[PDB]
Amino acid sequence: LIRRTAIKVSVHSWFSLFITVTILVNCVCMTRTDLPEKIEYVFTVIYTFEALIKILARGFCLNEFTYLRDPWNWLDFSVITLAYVGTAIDLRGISGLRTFRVLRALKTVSVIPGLKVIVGALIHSVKKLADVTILTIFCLSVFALVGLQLFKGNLKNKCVKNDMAYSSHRKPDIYINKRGTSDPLLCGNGSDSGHCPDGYICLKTSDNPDFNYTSFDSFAWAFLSLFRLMTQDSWERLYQQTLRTSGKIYMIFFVLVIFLGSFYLVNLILAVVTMAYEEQNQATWVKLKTILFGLVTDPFAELTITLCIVVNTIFMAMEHHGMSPTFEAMLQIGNIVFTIFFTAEMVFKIIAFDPYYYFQKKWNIFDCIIVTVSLLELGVAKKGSLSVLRSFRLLRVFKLAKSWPTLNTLIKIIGNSVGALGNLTIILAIIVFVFALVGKQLLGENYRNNRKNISAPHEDWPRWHMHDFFHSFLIVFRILCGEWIENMWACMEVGQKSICLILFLTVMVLGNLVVLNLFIALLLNSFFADVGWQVRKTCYRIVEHSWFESFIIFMILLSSGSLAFEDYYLDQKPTVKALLEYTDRVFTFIFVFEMLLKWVAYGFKKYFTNAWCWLDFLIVNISLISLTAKILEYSEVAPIKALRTLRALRPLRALSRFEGMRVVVDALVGAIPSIMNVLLVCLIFWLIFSIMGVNLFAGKFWRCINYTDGEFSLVPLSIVNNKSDCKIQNSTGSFFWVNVKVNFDNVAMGYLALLQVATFKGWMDIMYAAVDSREVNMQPKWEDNVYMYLYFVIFIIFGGFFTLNLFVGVIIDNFNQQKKKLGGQDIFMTEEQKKYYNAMKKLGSKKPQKPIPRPLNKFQGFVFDIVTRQAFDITIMVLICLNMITMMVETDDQSEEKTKILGKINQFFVAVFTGECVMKMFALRQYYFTNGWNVFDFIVVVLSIASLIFSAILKSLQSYFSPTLFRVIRLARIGRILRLIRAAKGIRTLLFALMMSLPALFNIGLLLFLVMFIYSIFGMSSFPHVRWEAGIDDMFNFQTFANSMLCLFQITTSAGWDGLLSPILNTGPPYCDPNLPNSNGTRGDCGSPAVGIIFFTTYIIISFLIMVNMYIAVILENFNVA
Ligand SMILES: CCCCCCCCCCCCCCCCCCOC[C@@H](O)COP(=O)(O)OCC[N+](C)(C)C
Ligand SMILES: *[C@@H]1O[C@H](CO)[C@@H](O[C@@H]2O[C@H](CO)[C@@H](O)[C@H](O)[C@H]2NC(C)=O)[C@H](O)[C@H]1NC(C)=O
Ligand SMILES: *[C@@H]1O[C@H](CO)[C@@H](O[C@@H]2O[C@H](CO)[C@@H](O)[C@H](O)[C@H]2NC(C)=O)[C@H](O)[C@H]1NC(C)=O
Ligand SMILES: CC(C)CCC[C@@H](C)[C@H]1CC[C@H]2[C@@H]3CC=C4C[C@@H](O)CC[C@]4(C)[C@H]3CC[C@]12C
Ligand SMILES: CC(C)CCC[C@@H](C)[C@H]1CC[C@H]2[C@@H]3CC=C4C[C@@H](O)CC[C@]4(C)[C@H]3CC[C@]12C
Ligand SMILES: CC(C)CCC[C@@H](C)[C@H]1CC[C@H]2[C@@H]3CC=C4C[C@@H](O)CC[C@]4(C)[C@H]3CC[C@]12C
Ligand SMILES: COc1cc(NC(=O)c2ccc(-c3ccc(Cl)cc3)o2)cc(OC)c1
Ligand SMILES: *[C@@H]1O[C@H](CO)[C@@H](O)[C@H](O)[C@H]1NC(C)=O
Ligand SMILES: *[C@@H]1O[C@H](CO)[C@@H](O)[C@H](O)[C@H]1NC(C)=O
């Protein structure tokens, strides 16, 4: 009973609070290495004493064996043991010593009241991801085998110099580096692969591009590359390398892999989480006279406040780098006036509403803190003193929340991540801290002793390392943003490869899982808790006839297609120009005749009140205005040329003709109104973050570079430190005071900078400029302001993660309301596509297998008996698995003997499968073909026999066509692997869901293709002379239709859109030459920053909208199937 009395006063939320404080202080202490001498010991001694209290505490609570029953108590026991060991003769400097200690940070779960239940939900969510994980592994293995077959040994191709006049290789293979980087150039010997400069031949080398880690030469390397593609981490770089070493047509491959693997799977995972989280939740005297007037705070007074806030915001949003002294003084005067006005409010209110009651409110204390900080800066007014708190006023914009229902929704989602859903945030913080400390402890010293290998050519250290806690946390955060493989390559070259693999993969997977469970949890909990009349009749007859509609559709298709031949090289084709010219004239005449027919049949009112006959009228007008200009002598006048660039809108006349595009456009139009309001809410938040960024980084991104021949180098600080020294040292006419293209020089360009940091493309350069910043007219210095990274870490958490949770919630609510209004009708689907969907519904549910009769003849019956059993199917399935393992061991440059043995094994396998097909056809006569999987096997067997015979015919025996054709012929063995889908019920259900969702995906992809075609035509007209820099290169440019479509497909996933915006943002020397010897567009290789920022930003927004609509379609299909 004594132990019971001790436990009464030894265990309670006080005891737990003390344990929490002790473990937290232990964590924060173990963050710092070289923790003070003589206390490195004293603290672990204190924390050792923590442990005796915890053991004696059990003794007063549980029993030696009952205590252990709980899984969490063993961790505590491990903690008590290690401690005692280290007191005497335990290795002092082994990596393991504190990695065992860092679990002690994970001990918070057992002491924080409600984390354990949340963790169990996480294991449940993991347990529901089984079938999707199996499908993902199968798909990645299949695509890795395909990639191995097609692209093995290609990324080892490099431009090697020729010889002048022979033992082995004549001197090291002198390569050439592609302009702007130090990486060696990759090429190919194909027609659409890539060409070397003069005096350079394509040769296969021994090394892979990045760090000998980017390859398709083995199943492991191909699997890693396909996992990278599925995660879409720098997938555009691999895309470009593969198309440069193999050919442009192979882009088709990638296309199929960024849709199946990278898109369809991301959506199963989402659904599998969503459904599961839902399952878990659906489971659960004169003072009095002043008071008379002080409480005169009527309706007008609150309006005055809102107007003052708005005017303060619009004055703070007009500061820039080039502010004049009078304008600068105007802003300071306005800020002082507003500050004294807000001080006046609070002093008037508080002395009206007694202080006690005034503080009792929650907006009032917010007002108080804002105004106190404002006055604090008003007192200590230095030029640059706490610029972040100079922007602190901006939070007054949240005052508008009380009347703006969507801002209140953002503020509730923000507050829910620390309230009802605080446990997920706590676990995320613990995971980030634990992996950061583990990475620092295991791979800290290697990063410092081997830095030369992973550092930039002119730098003396890597930009992302693990020597200290801050940089390890930055690496973990960047992994949580989807960028992991480059730092993984960097760490494999500096430390242990196995540790890198395990650490990076575990961090990525287990952090993305918790980030999704918080995103979905926030979404759910927040949001969802006379003769003229006769001829008119005749014309009416003419218009609604089917042949006329077909003719008009064919004319529109031809008009759209003819635009794809007006490219950079049309001036070199003399006859094509005239042919296209006459074709355009006749098409314009035809469409004018159509418009007159619709004006004489439909009637003017009907015509001008249909919104699909206005978009046709407008296009006909544009064309007529152009044609009249061309027949006259005003074709080169600048307004008219701009009107002519509007000929890329001609493909928009196909929307009204085809019904699927029409219905999907109607669905988008029905969603636009709410998208507008959420967009306004986001703009006001990102203005608070853009005004903050302008306060921090205005005019501080200017550098001096040494530009010689297409490569620039930052001038070292030992020679140049100021803009003034930069001019005096420009002796060779080769130093230039340049600026970062995407800077924070004003609020307008700050919006572009935050778009690159939110989409995570181009954010890296913006951050590096910010973290090297110094005062204006001073050369940037390496990480002078390292703690500026945090600023970008707070934008991504609040600006991006929480303003996408708002957008997705609003979209889901709108979609649900629209469905319900359409009586829960399948949107994105045409009427006959609904019949197709009903037929697909009926197929999947018919269980009857109607076994087939037994053949009368004895031998046929015997074959029937030996075929129908389940042992036959199991044996064939394990044979297919053996064949898959046999194809997994193919490696580039292996041996002749291995190739011969593998070929003989393939011959044996195809013979075995042909014998089973013959036996099945001899046992099952017509019934065999009645089934749909037997036809598939039959097709696979025929394709394999055809592959063998055609390879045998087309080998040395006959015409030796390009060897790469053989590589395509042996792609017929993957069907044997695809025959394994027959047994896997989960895979066969997920693929059925995909088949069910295909019909609407077709229409949405039709809109995506139309959008890509229109933008290609604009880009091809506007950006075809820009100098090759960054993304734009001799293969991915805007000089032809295929080159433009490659870039637009690449940036459809927003990948590398900053790399294509970079060359268009050039407006002069040293990057662009104005008055270039021979270019007619702007006389030069410069770009159009304004047209470029509208093109690349509008495209990504529209693409995101289309993708999220596809996401909704696929997720609802998955829910319906399950
Ligand atoms: C750079 C220049 C900008 C590029 C322009 C891009 C424009 C995108 C094209 C969108 C055009 C908008 C077309 C809008 C389609 C709807 C046009 C719809 O009106 C036609 C009707 O037949 C179909 O609509 P409903 O009849 O269902 O609606 C009946 C109206 N009440 C009576 C129910 C209210
Ligand atoms: C630009 O930077 C350089 C280097 O910091 C400045 O030169 C120094 O100026 C101080 C006086 O402020 C002298 O005491 C040092 O001896 C100077 N060091 C030298 C010669 O490098 C230079 O004056 C600055 N120019 C400006 C103001 O733009
Ligand atoms: C260094 O000198 C070079 C050449 O003397 C300067 O390059 C000039 O740049 C201006 C505009 O910035 C152009 O109008 C000239 O055509 C360029 N001249 C040549 C010959 O290229 C460069 O601006 C100087 N850098 C600094 C900032 O001192
Ligand atoms: C303004 C130019 C550039 C585009 C022209 C768009 C305007 C005139 C077009 C687009 C859609 C058309 C409308 C579609 C809806 C209707 C149908 C009927 O209920 C009355 C007129 C009204 C409201 C039409 C008036 C004109 C209209 C709004
Ligand atoms: C079963 C799971 C873990 C996947 C493993 C399948 C095996 C067959 C795959 C995975 C990686 C593949 C290896 C990748 C690279 C090589 C190097 C070569 O010198 C022998 C073949 C070999 C060793 C391949 C053998 C087959 C391989 C081991
Ligand atoms: C009860 C049912 C209707 C609830 C369904 C909730 C679904 C629709 C929610 C939960 C998680 C959400 C997804 C979370 C992440 C993304 C990625 C983004 O790039 C497109 C939107 C998309 C795909 C969201 C779409 C809506 C979504 C799938
Ligand atoms: C080929 O089929 C498609 C694949 C995708 N795939 C994606 O993987 C993806 C990831 C991130 C984004 C994305 C992120 C941010 C912005 Cl602003 C825009 C886009 O897209 C998207 C499609 O939509 C058109 C179509
Ligand atoms: C390219 O062709 C040259 C001969 O012109 C040959 O020597 C070289 O090896 C070829 N490379 C490849 C990979 O085809
Ligand atoms: C820049 O390039 C030139 C050669 O073109 C070189 O002479 C100069 O020294 C380089 N930069 C520095 C460090 O001054």
Side-chain angles (χ1 to χ4, degrees), residues 6 11-165 170 172-712 714-955 957-1122:
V11 296
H12 168 81
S13 183
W14 291 133
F15 195 56
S16 61
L17 188 69
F18 190 59
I19 304 169
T20 300
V21 159
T22 51
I23 59 178
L24 262 70
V25 63
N26 176 40
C27 301
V28 65
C29 281
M30 65 182 179
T31 75
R32 291 193 297 274
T33 56
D34 300 359
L35 182 61
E37 60 180 0
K38 182 60 60 180
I39 68 64
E40 181 62 6
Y41 297 92
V42 176
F43 292 94
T44 182
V45 177
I46 301 179
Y47 302 100
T48 299
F49 181 86
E50 179 181 1
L52 294 174
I53 301 300
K54 289 57 181 178
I55 295 169
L56 300 175
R58 176 188 58 88
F60 304 118
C61 300
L62 299 176
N63 183 6
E64 303 178 1
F65 177 80
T66 62
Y67 177 85
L68 299 177
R69 301 180 182 270
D70 181 5
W72 301 94
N73 299 358
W74 296 283
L75 180 57
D76 302 2
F77 180 88
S78 180
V79 167
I80 70 180
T81 60
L82 300 164
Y84 284 81
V85 171
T87 301
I89 65 180
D90 182 3
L91 299 294
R92 298 63 181 180
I94 298 300
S95 300
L97 180 59
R98 183 179 300 180
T99 59
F100 296 105
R101 298 178 59 180
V102 305
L103 289 209
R104 294 201 320 161
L106 281 183
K107 284 212 311 313
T108 66
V109 180
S110 307
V111 176
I112 300 299
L115 298 184
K116 299 181 300 180
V117 296
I118 302 300
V119 178
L122 299 177
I123 297 89
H124 153 267
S125 176
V126 176
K127 293 188 314 181
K128 302 288 213 67
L129 283 177
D131 281 317
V132 164
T133 296
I134 297 156
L135 170 71
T136 308
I137 300 174
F138 182 72
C139 288
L140 294 173
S141 74
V142 160
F143 281 116
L145 281 162
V146 171
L148 188 153
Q149 183 83 240
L150 300 167
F151 309 124
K152 59 180 164 195
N154 271 173
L155 293 112
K156 295 193 180 128
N157 284 353
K158 260 174 243 210
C159 280
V160 175
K161 264 193 51 63
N162 273 336
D163 56 272
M164 301 65 68
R170 284 219 231 153
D173 271 28
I174 298 169
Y175 320 115
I176 196 170
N177 301 341
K178 67 184 289 184
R179 304 171 61 51
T181 76
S182 64
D183 293 331
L185 192 58
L186 309 195
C187 67
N189 267 3
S191 64
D192 46 354
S193 296
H195 310 286
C196 284
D198 178 75
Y200 278 90
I201 52 180
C202 289
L203 282 184
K204 188 171 160 185
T205 63
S206 308
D207 283 317
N208 284 307
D210 282 302
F211 278 107
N212 223 325
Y213 298 129
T214 301
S215 193
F216 274 99
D217 290 358
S218 294
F219 187 74
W221 293 122
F223 199 89
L224 172 78
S225 297
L226 274 296
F227 183 76
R228 159 191 189 178
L229 285 161
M230 169 201 100
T231 58
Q232 286 179 78
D233 183 27
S234 296
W235 86 265
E236 72 287 337
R237 178 172 167 89
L238 179 62
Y239 174 69
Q240 292 192 354
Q241 292 160 332
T242 306
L243 299 200
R244 202 159 261 261
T245 54
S246 296
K248 291 174 174 163
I249 198 55
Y250 289 103
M251 71 95 78
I252 303 177
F253 168 81
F254 286 92
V255 177
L256 276 166
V257 176
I258 286 277
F259 161 62
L260 299 178
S262 301
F263 178 91
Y264 181 76
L265 300 174
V266 177
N267 289 337
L268 280 69
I269 302 164
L270 262 54
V272 174
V273 175
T274 302
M275 292 177 72
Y277 182 84
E278 299 180 359
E279 180 181 1
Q280 296 297 355
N281 297 4
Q282 79 189 103
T284 296
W285 300 270
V286 296
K287 298 63 61 180
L288 299 177
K289 300 180 181 300
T290 62
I291 293 180
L292 301 177
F293 298 92
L295 294 59
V296 179
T297 302
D298 299 358
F300 300 93
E302 60 180 0
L303 300 180
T304 301
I305 308 302
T306 299
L307 201 53
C308 293
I309 299 171
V310 168
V311 179
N312 192 31
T313 313
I314 63 170
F315 262 36
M316 293 182 286
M318 294 182 286
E319 51 159 347
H320 43 95
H321 176 46
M323 293 177 70
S324 79
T326 59
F327 182 76
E328 207 157 2
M330 182 179 72
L331 276 70
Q332 323 274 290
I333 278 176
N335 266 20
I336 297 307
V337 167
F338 286 134
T339 307
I340 77 165
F341 167 90
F342 291 122
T343 287
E345 183 178 2
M346 176 178 73
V347 189
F348 281 8
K349 298 218 300 205
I350 293 196
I351 304 184
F353 328 115
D354 299 0
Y356 305 97
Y357 303 96
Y358 180 95
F359 295 91
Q360 299 179 0
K361 272 78 72 177
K362 293 179 179 179
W363 279 108
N364 280 359
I365 62 170
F366 172 75
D367 295 349
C368 205
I369 62 170
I370 306 290
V371 65
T372 61
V373 185
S374 298
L375 294 174
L376 188 153
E377 297 210 336
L378 185 139
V380 290
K382 323 309 162 213
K383 306 313 143 186
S385 178
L386 295 174
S387 284
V388 170
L389 283 72
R390 185 171 41 130
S391 320
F392 182 76
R393 294 183 181 277
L394 299 177
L395 323 174
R396 275 198 193 100
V397 176
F398 290 105
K399 267 274 202 75
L400 281 73
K402 293 179 179 179
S403 305
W404 202 354
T406 308
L407 205 62
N408 224 359
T409 307
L410 184 57
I411 297 171
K412 292 151 53 179
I413 300 158
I414 295 166
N416 266 1
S417 80
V418 299
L421 281 173
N423 300 340
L424 293 173
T425 301
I426 297 172
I427 306 167
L428 190 63
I430 303 160
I431 289 175
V432 165
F433 163 91
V434 163
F435 272 117
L437 194 70
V438 164
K440 169 182 149 54
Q441 289 296 74
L442 294 180
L443 307 173
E445 291 287 311
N446 297 115
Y447 271 97
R448 195 208 72 217
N449 301 325
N450 292 325
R451 58 182 179 91
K452 295 61 61 180
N453 300 7
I454 60 180
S455 60
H458 279 298
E459 286 176 2
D460 271 351
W461 249 108
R463 282 257 187 210
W464 299 82
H465 59 79
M466 285 197 205
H467 191 241
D468 55 274
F469 185 77
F470 192 45
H471 282 91
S472 297
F473 161 74
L474 290 174
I475 291 175
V476 177
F477 193 77
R478 191 183 159 181
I479 292 169
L480 291 197
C481 297
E483 296 200 351
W484 56 274
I485 193 166
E486 200 175 349
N487 286 340
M488 200 191 82
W489 300 330
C491 82
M492 301 215 268
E493 215 65 42
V494 72
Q496 283 258 320
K497 313 213 190 323
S498 65
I499 307 175
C500 287
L501 269 295
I502 62 170
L503 183 62
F504 275 73
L505 295 168
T506 55
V507 172
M508 201 215 88
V509 171
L510 163 71
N512 294 149
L513 182 75
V514 190
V515 179
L516 295 174
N517 281 263
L518 189 50
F519 199 93
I520 294 182
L522 287 169
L523 288 166
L524 269 57
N525 286 36
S526 185
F527 282 98
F528 312 120
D530 185 36
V531 298
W533 161 256
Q534 293 147 0
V535 298
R536 285 205 47 170
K537 301 176 321 203
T538 311
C539 295
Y540 201 78
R541 294 171 50 201
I542 297 164
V543 179
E544 271 86 30
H545 199 298
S546 193
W547 286 128
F548 191 91
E549 181 68 330
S550 161
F551 182 65
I552 301 296
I553 288 183
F554 184 60
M555 288 309 103
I556 297 158
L557 290 164
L558 259 62
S559 306
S560 295
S562 79
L563 288 161
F565 297 77
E566 296 148 16
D567 49 33
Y568 198 70
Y569 310 98
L570 186 146
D571 312 298
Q572 313 313 350
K573 315 183 203 165
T575 61
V576 182
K577 187 185 288 185
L579 183 63
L580 262 53
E581 279 184 6
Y582 293 131
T583 291
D584 279 20
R585 292 143 82 72
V586 309
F587 280 157
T588 306
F589 177 78
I590 287 166
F591 286 106
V592 172
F593 184 70
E594 182 179 1
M595 191 205 58
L596 297 196
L597 275 179
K598 292 208 234 185
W599 279 8
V600 75
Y602 287 12
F604 299 93
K605 180 181 180 300
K606 181 179 180 180
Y607 186 92
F608 297 95
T609 67
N610 175 344
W612 276 127
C613 281
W614 252 94
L615 171 71
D616 298 358
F617 177 83
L618 299 176
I619 301 180
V620 177
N621 298 358
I622 300 180
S623 300
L624 296 178
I625 300 180
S626 300
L627 188 153
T628 61
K630 293 157 52 79
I631 62 170
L632 293 175
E633 293 293 356
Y634 303 70
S635 178
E636 70 275 350
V637 179
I640 301 181
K641 183 61 180 180
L643 299 177
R644 181 180 181 270
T645 62
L646 290 192
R647 277 174 37 178
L649 269 43
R650 269 156 48 168
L652 282 160
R653 292 178 292 178
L655 296 167
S656 179
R657 314 289 167 175
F658 307 103
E659 198 179 1
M661 271 167 291
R662 261 202 297 103
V663 307
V664 181
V665 171
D666 300 352
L668 269 65
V669 168
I672 297 299
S674 64
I675 297 170
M676 291 295 118
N677 184 7
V678 179
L679 180 59
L680 300 177
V681 175
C682 300
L683 298 177
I684 304 303
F685 177 80
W686 287 30
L687 177 74
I688 290 165
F689 276 106
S690 194
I691 298 174
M692 211 205 298
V694 171
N695 284 136
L696 289 169
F697 309 128
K700 296 172 162 168
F701 285 11
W702 291 81
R703 321 160 284 199
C704 296
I705 63 179
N706 186 1
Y707 184 92
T708 59
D709 58 357
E711 297 65 12
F712 64 70
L714 211 63
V715 184
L717 280 153
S718 321
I719 299 63
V720 69
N721 184 11
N722 287 344
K723 180 180 180 300
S724 180
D725 299 359
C726 190
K727 299 181 179 180
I728 303 180
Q729 301 299 355
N730 184 6
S731 60
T732 55
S734 65
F735 279 161
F736 296 116
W737 187 252
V738 290
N739 189 358
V740 186
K741 306 178 206 182
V742 186
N743 60 8
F744 293 101
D745 275 19
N746 60 48
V747 188
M749 191 85 108
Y751 264 102
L752 182 54
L754 293 182
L755 183 52
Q756 293 206 354
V757 176
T759 60
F760 305 104
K761 301 300 180 300
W763 64 296
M764 190 61 59
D765 299 357
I766 303 179
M767 301 178 62
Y768 304 138
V771 180
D772 298 0
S773 299
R774 299 176 60 181
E775 300 179 359
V776 178
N777 298 356
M778 265 200 330
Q779 182 64 5
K781 179 180 180 300
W782 178 269
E783 299 181 0
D784 184 1
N785 299 358
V786 51
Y787 297 92
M788 281 295 158
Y789 280 121
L790 271 182
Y791 161 82
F792 298 97
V793 167
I794 305 176
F795 178 59
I796 297 168
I797 293 180
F798 287 105
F801 178 96
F802 282 123
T803 80
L804 189 71
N805 193 283
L806 193 70
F807 184 100
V808 181
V810 173
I811 298 320
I812 300 168
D813 213 353
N814 178 69
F815 169 83
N816 283 340
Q817 293 324 110
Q818 198 172 12
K819 185 216 319 169
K820 184 172 41 43
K821 183 178 179 180
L822 177 63
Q825 248 296 353
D826 297 293
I827 71 161
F828 305 131
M829 185 180 288
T830 303
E831 285 289 334
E832 67 272 14
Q833 295 193 300
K834 294 180 176 180
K835 299 192 171 307
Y836 304 170
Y837 184 97
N838 302 317
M840 291 195 208
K841 283 271 291 183
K842 281 197 149 304
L843 270 183
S845 59
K846 58 181 192 194
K847 178 180 303 179
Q849 70 290 343
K850 293 179 179 179
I852 80 175
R854 159 75 166 272
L856 294 174
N857 175 49
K858 178 182 63 169
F859 186 50
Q860 294 179 356
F862 204 111
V863 190
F864 187 82
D865 311 315
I866 62 170
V867 161
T868 188
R869 294 206 162 87
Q870 185 159 125
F872 193 98
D873 191 50
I874 291 281
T875 310
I876 297 298
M877 277 272 178
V878 301
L879 290 158
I880 301 159
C881 298
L882 286 178
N883 189 358
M884 179 190 203
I885 304 163
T886 317
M887 311 155 38
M888 291 186 188
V889 301
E890 298 254 8
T891 305
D892 187 81
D893 189 358
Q894 41 194 13
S895 68
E896 177 195 12
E897 58 176 59
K898 191 172 178 189
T899 300
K900 280 172 45 182
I901 297 150
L902 261 52
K904 298 196 80 180
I905 291 164
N906 197 52
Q907 289 189 355
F908 160 88
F909 269 118
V910 67
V912 164
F913 294 143
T914 296
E916 158 211 19
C917 184
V918 176
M919 294 182 286
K920 291 164 150 303
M921 294 182 286
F922 181 60
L924 291 75
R925 336 182 81 80
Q926 302 67 13
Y927 306 96
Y928 177 88
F929 298 93
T930 65
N931 191 358
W933 272 117
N934 292 335
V935 179
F936 184 69
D937 307 348
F938 189 62
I939 288 170
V940 174
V941 163
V942 172
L943 275 182
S944 288
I945 289 149
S947 178
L948 277 71
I949 62 170
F950 292 165
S951 296
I953 295 169
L954 183 63
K955 73 156 289 293
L957 262 63
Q958 283 313 0
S959 171
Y960 57 101
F961 187 74
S962 179
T964 61
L965 189 71
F966 280 50
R967 302 168 72 92
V968 186
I969 287 171
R970 304 177 51 218
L971 272 183
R973 311 167 178 178
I974 294 91
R976 306 194 285 241
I977 309 154
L978 304 176
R979 296 177 45 177
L980 281 163
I981 298 169
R982 186 174 180 178
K985 197 179 172 81
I987 296 170
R988 209 175 62 256
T989 295
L990 309 186
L991 292 172
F992 188 86
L994 174 47
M995 185 180 288
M996 281 275 258
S997 66
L998 289 173
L1001 284 168
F1002 186 65
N1003 297 352
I1004 315 179
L1006 282 172
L1007 289 176
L1008 183 63
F1009 174 75
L1010 185 78
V1011 161
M1012 294 182 286
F1013 188 86
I1014 300 179
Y1015 290 87
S1016 299
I1017 306 300
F1018 292 96
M1020 182 177 60
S1021 60
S1022 300
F1023 318 132
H1025 299 90
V1026 180
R1027 179 179 299 181
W1028 311 100
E1029 180 180 359
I1032 300 180
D1033 58 357
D1034 57 273
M1035 291 202 46
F1036 305 87
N1037 52 78
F1038 281 95
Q1039 306 189 131
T1040 50
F1041 183 72
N1043 292 358
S1044 297
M1045 281 285 248
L1046 294 174
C1047 301
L1048 296 198
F1049 165 63
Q1050 163 191 334
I1051 70 173
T1052 302
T1053 62
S1054 87
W1057 75 266
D1058 59 293
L1060 304 165
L1061 187 53
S1062 191
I1064 299 159
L1065 285 170
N1066 282 336
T1067 61
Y1071 302 95
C1072 170
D1073 183 8
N1075 300 359
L1076 180 60
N1078 187 8
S1079 299
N1080 300 359
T1082 66
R1083 299 179 59 90
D1085 56 356
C1086 296
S1088 59
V1091 177
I1093 297 168
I1094 302 186
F1095 179 109
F1096 290 104
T1097 59
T1098 55
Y1099 187 71
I1100 55 168
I1101 291 154
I1102 301 166
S1103 295
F1104 174 75
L1105 275 182
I1106 286 170
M1107 95 179 195
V1108 298
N1109 290 29
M1110 293 180 183
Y1111 274 120
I1112 301 295
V1114 175
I1115 295 165
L1116 277 296
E1117 291 294 329
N1118 274 117
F1119 276 125
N1120 210 342
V1121 174

